[PDB]
Every structure is written in structure tokens, then in C-alpha cells.
Motif scaffolding. Structure first.
Motif, PDB file in Angstrom:
ATOM      1  N   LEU A  60       0.847  -1.206   0.000  1.00  0.00           N
ATOM      2  CA  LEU A  60       0.000   0.000   0.000  1.00  0.00           C
ATOM      3  C   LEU A  60       0.876   1.248   0.000  1.00  0.00           C
ATOM      4  N   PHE A  61       0.590   2.202  -0.915  1.00  0.00           N
ATOM      5  CA  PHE A  61       1.414   3.398  -1.256  1.00  0.00           C
ATOM      6  C   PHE A  61       0.590   4.641  -1.098  1.00  0.00           C
ATOM      7  N   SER A  62       0.747   5.478  -0.033  1.00  0.00           N
ATOM      8  CA  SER A  62      -0.201   6.275   0.665  1.00  0.00           C
ATOM      9  C   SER A  62      -0.624   7.604   0.049  1.00  0.00           C
ATOM     10  N   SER A  63      -1.917   7.908   0.047  1.00  0.00           N
ATOM     11  CA  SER A  63      -2.597   9.034  -0.569  1.00  0.00           C
ATOM     12  C   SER A  63      -2.408  10.338   0.228  1.00  0.00           C
ATOM     13  N   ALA A  64      -2.779  10.260   1.530  1.00  0.00           N
ATOM     14  CA  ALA A  64      -2.600  11.297   2.550  1.00  0.00           C
ATOM     15  C   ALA A  64      -1.718  10.848   3.713  1.00  0.00           C
ATOM     16  N   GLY A  65      -1.597   9.511   3.926  1.00  0.00           N
ATOM     17  CA  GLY A  65      -1.094   8.891   5.144  1.00  0.00           C
ATOM     18  C   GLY A  65      -1.990   7.853   5.793  1.00  0.00           C
ATOM     19  N   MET A  66      -2.951   8.308   6.631  1.00  0.00           N
ATOM     20  CA  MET A  66      -3.694   7.513   7.618  1.00  0.00           C
ATOM     21  C   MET A  66      -5.190   7.394   7.224  1.00  0.00           C
ATOM     22  N   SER A  67      -5.361   7.004   5.910  1.00  0.00           N
ATOM     23  CA  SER A  67      -6.562   6.300   5.409  1.00  0.00           C
ATOM     24  C   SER A  67      -6.206   4.905   4.843  1.00  0.00           C
ATOM     25  N   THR A  68      -4.974   4.439   5.244  1.00  0.00           N
ATOM     26  CA  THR A  68      -4.242   3.254   4.777  1.00  0.00           C
ATOM     27  C   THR A  68      -3.605   2.462   5.918  1.00  0.00           C
ATOM     28  N   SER A  69      -2.721   3.138   6.672  1.00  0.00           N
ATOM     29  CA  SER A  69      -1.787   2.560   7.667  1.00  0.00           C
ATOM     30  C   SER A  69      -2.489   1.621   8.649  1.00  0.00           C
TER      31      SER A  69
ATOM     32  N   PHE B 270       3.470   2.120   2.482  1.00  0.00           N
ATOM     33  CA  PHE B 270       4.615   3.049   2.463  1.00  0.00           C
ATOM     34  C   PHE B 270       4.214   4.427   2.068  1.00  0.00           C
ATOM     35  N   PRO B 271       5.144   5.406   1.965  1.00  0.00           N
ATOM     36  CA  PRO B 271       4.967   6.747   1.417  1.00  0.00           C
ATOM     37  C   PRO B 271       5.172   7.063  -0.060  1.00  0.00           C
ATOM     38  N   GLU B 272       4.444   6.236  -0.860  1.00  0.00           N
ATOM     39  CA  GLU B 272       4.642   5.981  -2.255  1.00  0.00           C
ATOM     40  C   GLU B 272       6.082   6.151  -2.776  1.00  0.00           C
ATOM     41  N   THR B 273       7.083   6.112  -1.856  1.00  0.00           N
ATOM     42  CA  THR B 273       8.526   6.362  -2.083  1.00  0.00           C
ATOM     43  C   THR B 273       9.283   5.047  -2.410  1.00  0.00           C
ATOM     44  N   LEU B 274       8.697   3.917  -1.948  1.00  0.00           N
ATOM     45  CA  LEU B 274       9.277   2.565  -1.845  1.00  0.00           C
ATOM     46  C   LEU B 274       8.775   1.744  -3.058  1.00  0.00           C
ATOM     47  N   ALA B 275       7.560   2.109  -3.558  1.00  0.00           N
ATOM     48  CA  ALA B 275       6.671   1.235  -4.337  1.00  0.00           C
ATOM     49  C   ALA B 275       7.406   0.666  -5.568  1.00  0.00           C
ATOM     50  N   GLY B 276       8.313   1.534  -6.133  1.00  0.00           N
ATOM     51  CA  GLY B 276       9.333   1.089  -7.097  1.00  0.00           C
ATOM     52  C   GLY B 276      10.015  -0.219  -6.637  1.00  0.00           C
ATOM     53  N   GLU B 277      10.668  -0.177  -5.466  1.00  0.00           N
ATOM     54  CA  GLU B 277      11.430  -1.248  -4.874  1.00  0.00           C
ATOM     55  C   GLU B 277      10.503  -2.264  -4.109  1.00  0.00           C
TER      56      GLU B 277
ATOM     57  N   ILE C 199       4.121   4.399 -11.588  1.00  0.00           N
ATOM     58  CA  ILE C 199       4.149   3.126 -10.772  1.00  0.00           C
ATOM     59  C   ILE C 199       4.189   1.925 -11.768  1.00  0.00           C
ATOM     60  N   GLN C 200       3.498   2.124 -12.922  1.00  0.00           N
ATOM     61  CA  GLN C 200       3.227   1.105 -13.939  1.00  0.00           C
ATOM     62  C   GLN C 200       4.366   0.952 -14.961  1.00  0.00           C
ATOM     63  N   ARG C 201       5.250   1.963 -15.041  1.00  0.00           N
ATOM     64  CA  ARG C 201       6.582   1.838 -15.695  1.00  0.00           C
ATOM     65  C   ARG C 201       7.517   0.981 -14.819  1.00  0.00           C
ATOM     66  N   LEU C 202       7.907   1.607 -13.652  1.00  0.00           N
ATOM     67  CA  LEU C 202       8.588   0.949 -12.518  1.00  0.00           C
ATOM     68  C   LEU C 202       8.207  -0.531 -12.471  1.00  0.00           C
ATOM     69  N   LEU C 203       6.893  -0.854 -12.616  1.00  0.00           N
ATOM     70  CA  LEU C 203       6.306  -2.199 -12.748  1.00  0.00           C
ATOM     71  C   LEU C 203       5.176  -2.143 -13.799  1.00  0.00           C
TER      72      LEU C 203
END
Length: 106
Positions: A8-17, A39-46, A67-71
Motif C-alpha cells: 500500500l502506497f499512501s494518498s494522505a497517510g492515515m486512510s491506509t496505515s 509506504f509513502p509511495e517512495t518505496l513502491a518502485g522497490e 508506478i506502472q513503468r517501474l512495474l
């Protein structure tokens, strides 16, 4: 193996965590063989990589083309924003599944 990674790669933060940490509830309120991390959509690549199915914030939606290039294969899926900020990790267990079936197509 014997278990996979609902990421999960976060929109605002805490509607996910806590939606992962309930989606987690789900998994062990059952036995569903999957870690849910967000995560903080920072990781989602890795992390996206290290996941078997992916998610991203409704509101940072924009990144999904990226996100869809990365994957350019994975079962990535940006959330809903009220299932999100109502932290419904039981629609998010189902809704994951839905993703990994919206995978296939020739």
C-alpha cells in the motif's frame, strides 16, 4: 514462499496505515498467506517489486502511470478514498484479490 505481500502506497497517510493493520486483522482473523505493508509511495518502485499485489492512494492516483513503468506487469491498484479514510481492511482483502484477477488478459 508460502506467503505474499499486499503493499500500500499512501494518498494522505492515515486512510491506509490502519487499513493494512485491519486488512492484517482480516489475514490472521483468518490465515490468508500475505503480509500487508503500506509506504509513502517512495518505496513502491522497490517494495512494489517485493510485493505480489500493490496499492496506491486515491489522491496520489497520478503516480500509477509512473508506478506502472517501474512495474509494467504487476497487480497494482490505487484504493477508494472512503474505503481508504474509513480504513476497511476487509473490503481491502477482497479488493486486493479483485486486483490479482484484473491482472490477466491475453
Amino acid at each position: 514462499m508460502e506467503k505474499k505481500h499486499i503493499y500500500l502506497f499512501s494518498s494522505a497517510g492515515m486512510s491506509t496505515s490502519l487499513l493494512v493493520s485491519k486488512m492484517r486483522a482480516q489475514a490472521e482473523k483468518y490465515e490468508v498467506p500475505v503480509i500487508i505493508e503500506a509506504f509513502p509511495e517512495t518505496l513502491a518502485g522497490e517494495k512494489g517489486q517485493n510485493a505480489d499485489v500493490v496499492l496506491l492512494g486515491p489522491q496520489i492516483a497520478y503516480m500509477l502511470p509512473e508506478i506502472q513503468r517501474l512495474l509494467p506487469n504487476k497487480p497494482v491498484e490505487v484504493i477508494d478514498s472512503l474505503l481508504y479514510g474509513k480504513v476497511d481492511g476487509l473490503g481491502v482483502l477482497k479488493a486486493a484479490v479483485a486486483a490479482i484477477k484484473k491482472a490477466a488478459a491475453n
